[PDB]
Amino acid sequence: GKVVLDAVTHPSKIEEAEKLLEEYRERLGGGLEGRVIADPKADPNTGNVHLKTEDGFEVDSTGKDIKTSLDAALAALEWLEHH
Amino acid sequence: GKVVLDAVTHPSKIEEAEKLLEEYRERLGGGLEGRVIADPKADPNTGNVHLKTEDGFEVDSTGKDIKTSLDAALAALEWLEHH
């Protein structure tokens, strides 16, 4: 299904976040609609990802980098989609 | 460690949310500090849980009931605490 993903990042890490979104786009296919939000108030030392499905599931996940945040967020989404 | 948990629920489901927080308190011990937020704008058909550790990990999880939301939220927290 469609999953709308937002990577919210300090502007120094926009490149990082885009390259990561690129790997997950080509693994997860065309359902993944991801975008990078450039937030100067964001801590460069943390990652933050928000995802929303058209089914109404939502996860916000704040970790120490963007990749871990995302993986944890998809982990939680897999749980909700099954249980 | 300390985990601050918020169950945000329509006021009709406050009892449900408190009894659920009670089971997770006695399973997860005294580190779990959970509270019920009574939100009349919340859909009674969904669950929502937010957790925050003193380490800075945060997860917000919206599902179709409070138990699934919570389990998914702790699932994501376990991922962040390891990876």
Side-chain angles (χ1 to χ4, degrees), chain A residues 53-73:
Chain A
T53 68
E54 39 195 17
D55 261 332
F57 298 128
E58 271 189 79
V59 185
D60 200 275
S61 164
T62 304
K64 316 263 199 223
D65 59 284
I66 310 146
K67 168 115 179 345
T68 305
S69 280
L70 182 49
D71 285 346

Side-chain angles (χ1 to χ4, degrees), chain B residues 1 3-4 28-33 52-55 77 81:
Chain B
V3 186
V4 158
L28 296 213
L32 181 64
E33 143 197 347
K52 177 155 172 152
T53 68
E54 39 195 17
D55 261 332
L77 179 56
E81 282 175 327

Side-chain angles (χ1 to χ4, degrees), chain A residues 1 3-83:
Chain A
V3 186
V4 158
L5 181 75
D6 299 324
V8 180
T9 181
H10 185 273
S12 64
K13 310 206 298 183
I14 287 171
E15 212 78 6
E16 178 180 335
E18 178 67 32
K19 294 336 157 267
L20 189 82
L21 284 196
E22 259 314 318
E23 303 164 347
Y24 283 72
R25 277 178 197 130
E26 77 202 69
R27 225 138 46 222
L28 296 213
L32 181 64
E33 143 197 347
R35 64 169 102 139
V36 178
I37 286 77
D39 186 354
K41 289 187 160 181
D43 184 353
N45 284 320
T46 54
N48 174 253
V49 141
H50 183 100
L51 51 62
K52 177 155 172 152
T53 68
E54 39 195 17
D55 261 332
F57 298 128
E58 271 189 79
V59 185
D60 200 275
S61 164
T62 304
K64 316 263 199 223
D65 59 284
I66 310 146
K67 168 115 179 345
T68 305
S69 280
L70 182 49
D71 285 346
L74 296 168
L77 179 56
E78 213 56 21
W79 193 286
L80 296 169
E81 282 175 327
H82 301 358
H83 301 59

